[PDB]
Write a protein that binds this DNA or RNA. Structure first.
Lengths: 347, 53, 71, 96, 143, 67, 107, 158
RNA sequence: ACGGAAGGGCACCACCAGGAGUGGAGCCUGCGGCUUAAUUUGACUCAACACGGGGAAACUCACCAGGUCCAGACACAAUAAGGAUUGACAGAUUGAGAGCUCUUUCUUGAUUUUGUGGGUGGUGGUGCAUGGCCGUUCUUAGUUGGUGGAGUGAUUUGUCUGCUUAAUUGCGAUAACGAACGAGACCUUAACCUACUAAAUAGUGGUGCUAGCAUUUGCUGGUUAUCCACUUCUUAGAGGGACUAUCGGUUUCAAGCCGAUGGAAGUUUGAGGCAAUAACAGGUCUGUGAUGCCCUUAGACGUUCUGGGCCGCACGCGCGCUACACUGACGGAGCCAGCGAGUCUAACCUUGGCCGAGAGGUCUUGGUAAUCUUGUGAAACUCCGUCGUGCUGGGGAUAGAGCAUUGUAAUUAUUGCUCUUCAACGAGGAAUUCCUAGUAAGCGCAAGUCAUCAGCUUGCGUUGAUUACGUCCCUGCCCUUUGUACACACC
């Protein structure tokens, strides 16, 4: 931030608290920008209520009716250090002094008197202005601020606000809402929709509904029916291949060779030869187009495919058309072998 | 170990040096880069200062 | 500077006038104006096309160089 | 170089738990980052380690790029006396 | 060393005023004025002697007039002589700023200028209606 | 001085040899015609080529040039 | 339930012109497509980082100098845009060399 | 953050430089070609080019991990912000750096200069280049220095 | 290759025509010598001498007088928990709360330790052992090999008799034919776009709120808020634009050249960047963890602390920037810019108000920057007054006395101011440097070194000339012919 380390002032007033959970105040030693490890010098013990319980309300700036209700004063305590994260630090405020903590520790005359004065001045009266800067960038941060400062004034909007004593009566209510939805709601959610595969599955439904295989009411259509027969991984393009009379122009050999593109790895060093007939080339082109389209449609939803399916078009699968076509005619196994690049078992 | 093995080096040619070569004379402070001028020349096109004029 | 500024302002006065004539008066008047000016032309309408040549090393100025010794 | 053995232990340990060590060439630095020791002490102990294999070095822009080996791992398990097939340097870890 | 007199009556614009500022009986001299060099990079005091401060008053009146809003440091930069050290020709160097400050402090009192937002100082509507009007009345008289 | 170089002259000549229909004896028209007719890298060079073609046409009209 | 406008200000800066202007034009296009008022593709004065140095490593030789200069081209673009389009336009348009920044809360 | 654009770009340049030099030093055997500092939102990717990803990538991503550690521990980044990669350089050549490395290694094995130089030039020619120039300075054969200059095809100098 | 041989062509690192100067304009720094405890050191015609980015108070530092520290990895013995080795308050000690060393004893716990091989570091040597880099030959048009031809061969031709070009550029000719590099082309930049894209981080105009001096409505801000309108200026992006364009002459009438017309731009439109082949035993091991061999390696030329020195000097030589005085210097009233640069894990650029003659101090503010510093309202010069020819008044050295700032530390004064000594100096022999247009010359300004210091450079503007627009005589360069007892090549 533009005033995160040096400009804000060494020993600035912040409201931190350990797991005891009570309203406290202290001075910043040095805002460590790495592991969030601020060494805060407290001057107040955990402020328990008149009843004798942990106080849950935070300093909600600018309101006499809010804070003086339950926070007329706080407890006075002498200097001792504690390390704490930035998450525990609640609301930073202005009322501070420029002199360091070392001076306070080593018993000076200028530091200690002014110090004690500041310790009790805060107690006597306090209606401070909050100050966190948005001038660096603010995109997520700005949004968060917008969310919060609307909810800041929303605390006055609701019914409970001008009570005689709220935080004395809250310990039951707090206990209920917080602890009853701590690991009951959450445990339930740990056996309702556990993994991200169910959400991702629902995103796989978005593409399956868009491609018109299953209808929008989540039931199978003719496209989904025909596709139910195909057990191979490249089923959607293959399903799309059977629609129009495009296939009717081909001969059986041409069809079977065309179908070889799907059932072959296509990982090799050697070059692809020229295609055996223009119809096959056309078919190949069509297939390529369809797979591009499918890649596009998958890509809009943003779901990662397998290394095989990510590669597909880049891999050298298309040479086996020229291979199997000859076999489909009625040719010797040597002749075809001497055409093809790959090993014989693979073929 | 030794409380006598360090003169003041708060400023001057002795304080700051070329990060590549560690010379003292011929140091490019401009734009807070701190590179030995010869070293800078060597890695000039690498950093991306191209000779136009 | 001062002379330069003067030159600029006079030029502006000229161009502004002729342009004004061109838009909001007939052309013949503007032609008359031009011909009156362009005959005299001290960069009256058109700007001065000379512009500072840069300084180069081994000398205080552009074409000037430092003195050499031999002995 | 002569130094307290605890510092050496810290060094050998941290290096084992990571695999890599870095150091700006500066004797008269005071504390070196991460490992709680002066920089000189680090640099010289690592040099000593390197001497007989175990860790490989690359100087590059005065920043000492130290990297652990296989024999080095064996040496460090021996020194730090911890079980094999359990605590290595940085082998597989990531899925890719 | 100074600025913005090329245009109108350089000397006469700020001479009939100079005696008129004495005529007013409102001016407020420092006390240590008139035994002073006027700049660090200068050499002699002014040759007007019984005056000069009144010239610099209307010159600072003119300065506040000049534009928008003006300061102290700016005045120092302006009336500053530039300093001649040895060989070291005449590098532009600040004025006896104290004098300008004093002038400002005087003018504010007389009801001509006031301290503005954005810092600096600005001319008033009532201000110069009477001050330099009589001096430039010579130009209106001649016309 | 203002002497035209090899790639301007030779290329111009080549153009006149295989495009005599078109290439009327005006500079500006040729200038765009050159951009259309063939790929040229820089603007300057193109312009030079156009100029030389114009010159050539101007001196083709008076008599049959050798080359 | 309007999806509220916040006045976004993008600040692209780079050492390249063609790689930068590409991203600029893309931003102009995408933002146009969504039908939003904006403050141009406003370009700034390009900053030249001039470094004068002697050619020779050591003093001997004719005193030859060498200018070494790096360009900085900078574009600021204000999209008077809703809270929706911030996340849509930030994720798109990334490039090695082109340093991209976005900022809001103009006052 | 909060650094001037001027200062910033220079810093980036410096980072790029130090990277390239380090990679050149460490990735010597592999035939390192070049890198690119691919800055992104939040993450900072770094593509590395070489002839082979034999041990640059590593066994199950070990040497690459080490390299990443070196990078992020050196310049002090948050773990998993900076990321390295290993792309194949194209044509085993045309990139001069790789070729220079190949020369260097051919020599240090124990070979005559001619064989190296003409091997390199022929390879370049095969790789579909317009032309090549290989110059070797220093002490070849004799005690006094000499400059052998091999070339083929075509070049430019202006 | 050279020639006080020929022919042709060239350059303000050559002249002519002049302009500005340098050997006394600031007195500076650099070198030589001299001096030296040291006064480190490289470079000596062009192509060493404000150069080493070298403006050094220490650190830089390498040199000198001294003092420590081990960062001697590793292996191999050997001493060795009845302790290897480390550290140690204080007395002595010494510039010195350096245990360095001793005195007294405590602490320490395999790390070291003394010895042997082997490393390591070195601003040590060698730039004539090298790499890289740079300079110069060489601000030049030159160099090559494929296949042909000639010659026993070295080699030659191509690469040329003319003509033209800044140019082996072309035009042509032709035992050569096509080709490649260099040149050109290319890149950046300098100028022109009242056309496109727009811009409160740039302007301008209109409407609510200002008209206070020359004002009735200069131009300015009141006006980050009053909303709207605009893109000429200002910024960029994309393009266009000049090609010697049209006309005339001139030439086998071809390449081209000279004038005129328009044109923002008509010397390759100016300026640069890039820049071939082969070289020099040019410079550099003091840029480099670039290195070979040599030298040294724990009273170490290693690293580090204390104090000097590199500033030892009226100069024996070299560069460098104000106004020798009335086209002047003052007192004021003077005076528009343009390159830039700028705080983070901190203290940079300073606006603002107060105090101070002053330099400065202070309380704060704006600024990670077309927004704030900062229209860097710079200087020379416009306007009146003061001298007016006088080593005087013109302007403020050399020496003294104080007050400020920066810095652990200013002493052989860092700088700055203030007063007293008063000096742009009597137009600089012989000699020699740069210079043809917004240049030369004047004048400041920023940046680079930087805590502080500029007269150093690197860029930037501002005012702005005279005199060629040529030649080969001097000094050199390129080609061709020729001569040669030269070839480390006319030294």
């Amino acid at each position: 931030s533009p005033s995160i380390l040096h400009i804000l002032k060494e020993g600035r007033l912040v409201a931190f608290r350990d797991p005891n959970d009570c309203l406290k105040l202290g001075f910043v030693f040095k805002v460590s920008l790495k592991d969030a490890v601020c060494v805060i010098m407290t001057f107040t013990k955990p402020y328990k209520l008149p009843n004798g319980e942990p106080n849950h309300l935070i300093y909600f700036p600018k309101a006499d009716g809010y804070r003086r209700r339950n926070f007329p004063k706080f407890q006075k305590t002498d200097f001792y250090m504690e390390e704490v994260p930035v998450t525990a630090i609640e609301v930073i405020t202005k009322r501070k002094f420029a002199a360091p903590l070392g001076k306070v520790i080593k018993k000076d005359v200028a530091a200690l008197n002014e110090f004690n004065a500041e310790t009790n001045n805060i107690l006597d009266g306090k209606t401070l202005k909050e100050a966190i800067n948005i001038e660096k960038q603010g995109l997520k941060i700005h949004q968060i601020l917008l969310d919060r400062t609307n909810i800041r004034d929303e605390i006055f909007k609701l019914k409970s606000i001008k009570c005689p004593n709220l935080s004395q009566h809250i310990v039951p209510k707090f206990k209920a809402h917080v602890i009853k939805k701590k690991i009951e709601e959450l445990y339930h959610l740990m056996s309702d929709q556990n993994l991200s595969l169910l959400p991702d599955y629902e995103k796989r439904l978005a593409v399956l509904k868009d491609t018109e295989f299953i209808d929008q009411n989540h039931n199978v259509l003719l496209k989904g029916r025909v596709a139910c027969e195909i057990n191979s991984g490249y089923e959607l393009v293959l399903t799309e291949l059977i629609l129009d009379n495009f296939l009717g122009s081909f001969e059986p050999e041409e069809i079977v060779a065309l179908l070889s593109v799907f059932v072959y790895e296509g990982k090799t060093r050697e070059e692809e030869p020229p295609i055996v007939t223009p119809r096959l080339a056309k078919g190949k082109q069509r297939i390529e187009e369809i797979y591009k389209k499918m890649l596009c449609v998958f890509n809009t939803h943003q779901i990662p495919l397998t290394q095989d399916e990510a590669e597909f078009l880049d891999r050298k699968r298309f040479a086996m058309m020229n291979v199997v076509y000859e076999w489909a005619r009625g040719l010797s196994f040597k002749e075809i072998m001497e055409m093809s690049p790959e090993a014989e078992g693979t073929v | 170990e030794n409380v006598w093995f360090s003169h003041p080096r708060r400023y001057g040619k002795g304080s700051r040096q070329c990060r590549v070569c560690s010379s003292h004379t011929g140091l490019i402070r401009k734009y807070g880069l701190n590179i030995c001028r010869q070293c800078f020349r060597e890695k000039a096109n690498d950093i991306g200062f191209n000779k136009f004029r | 500077g001062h002379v330069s500024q003067v030159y600029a302002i006079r030029q502006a006065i000229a161009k502004g006038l002729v342009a004004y004539h061109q838009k909001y008066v007939d052309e013949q008047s503007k032609n008359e104006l031009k011909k009156a000016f362009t005959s005299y032309d001290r960069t009256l309408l058109i700007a001065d096309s000379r512009r500072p040549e840069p300084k180069k090393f081994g000398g205080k100025g552009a074409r000037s160089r430092f003195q050499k010794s031999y002995r | 170089m002569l130094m307290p053995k605890e510092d050496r232990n810290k060094i050998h340990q941290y290096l084992f738990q990571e695999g890599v060590v870095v150091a700006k060439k500066d004797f008269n630095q005071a504390k070196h980052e991460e490992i709680d020791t002066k920089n000189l002490y680090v640099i010289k102990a690592l040099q000593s380690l390197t001497s007989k294999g175990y860790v490989k070095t690359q100087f590059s822009w005065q920043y000492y790029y130290y990297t652990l080996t296989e024999e080095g791992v064996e040496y460090l398990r021996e020194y730090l006396n911890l079980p094999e097939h359990i605590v290595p340097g940085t082998y597989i870890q990531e899925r890719n | 060393p100074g600025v913005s007199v090329r245009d109108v009556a350089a000397q006469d614009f700020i001479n009939a005023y100079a005696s008129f500022l004495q005529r007013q009986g409102k001016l407020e001299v420092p006390g240590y004025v008139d035994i002073v060099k006027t700049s660090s990079g200068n050499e002699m005091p002014p040759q007007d002697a019984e005056g000069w401060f009144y010239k610099r008053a209307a010159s600072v009146a003119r300065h506040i007039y000049m534009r928008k809003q003006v300061g102290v440091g700016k005045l120092n930069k302006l009336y500053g002589g530039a300093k001649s050290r040895g060989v070291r020709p005449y590098k532009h160097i600040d004025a006896s700023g104290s004098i300008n400050r004093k002038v400002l402090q005087a003018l504010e009192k007389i009801g001509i200028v006031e301290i503005s937002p954005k810092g600096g100082r600005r001319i008033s509507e009532n201000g110069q209606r009477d001050l330099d009007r009589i001096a430039a009345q010579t130009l209106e008289e001649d016309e | 001085g203002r002497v035209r170089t090899k790639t301007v002259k030779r290329a111009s000549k080549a153009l006149i040899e295989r495009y005599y229909p078109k290439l009327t004896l005006d500079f500006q028209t040729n200038k765009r015609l050159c951009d259309e007719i063939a790929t040229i890298q820089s603007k300057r060079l193109r312009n030079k080529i156009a100029g030389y073609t114009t010159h050539l046409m101007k001196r083709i009209q008076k008599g049959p040039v050798r080359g | 339930q309007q999806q509220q406008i916040i006045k976004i200000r993008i600040t692209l800066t780079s050492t390249k012109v063609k790689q930068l202007e590409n991203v600029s034009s893309n931003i102009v296009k995408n933002a146009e497509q969504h039908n939003l008022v904006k403050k141009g593709p406003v370009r700034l004065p390009t900053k030249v980082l001039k470094i004068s140095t002697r050619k020779t490593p050591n003093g001997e030789g004719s005193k030859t100098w060498e200018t070494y200069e790096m360009r900085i081209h900078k574009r600021y673009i204000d999209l008077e845009a809703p809270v929706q389009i911030v996340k849509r336009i930030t994720q798109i348009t990334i490039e090695p060399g082109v340093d991209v920044e976005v900022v809001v809360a103009s006052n | 953050a909060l650094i001037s654009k001027k200062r910033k770009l220079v810093a980036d340049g410096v980072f790029y430089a130090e990277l390239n030099e380090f990679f050149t030093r460490e990735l010597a055997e592999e035939g390192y070609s070049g890198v690119e500092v691919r800055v992104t939102p939040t993450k900072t990717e770094v593509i590395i080019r070489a002839t082979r990803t034999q041990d640059v990538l590593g066994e199950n991503g070990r040497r690459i991990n080490e390299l990443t550690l070196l990078v992020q521990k050196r310049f002090k980044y948050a773990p998993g912000t900076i990321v390295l990669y290993a792309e194949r350089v194209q044509d085993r050549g045309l990139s001069a750096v790789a070729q220079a490395e190949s020369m260097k290694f051919k020599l240090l094995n124990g070979l005559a200069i001619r064989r190296a130089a003409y091997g390199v030039v022929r390879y370049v020619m095969e790789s579909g280049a317009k032309g090549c120039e290989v110059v070797v300075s220093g002490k070849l054969r004799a005690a006094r220095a000499k400059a052998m200059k091999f070339a083929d095809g075509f070049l430019i100098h202006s």
